Amino acid sequence: CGETCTLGTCYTAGCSCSWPVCTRNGVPI
Numbered sequence: 001c002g003e004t005c006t007l008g009t010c011y012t013a014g015c016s017c018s019w020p021v022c023t024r025n026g027v028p029i
Contacts, residue, residue, distance in 0.1 A: 001029055 001015035001022035010022035021028045 001010060001012040001024050003010055003012045003015060003022040004020050005017035005022050006020050008017055008019065010017045012022060012024075015022040015024045017023075018028075023029075
């Protein structure tokens with residue numbers, strides 16, 4: 001997702017926070 005989530009939430013579509021990195025399909029893309 002190329003997105004970090006230091007405050008606990010991801011905003012990129014389909015991405016979820018695995019503090020402190022956003023993941024999609026289980027990977028930080």
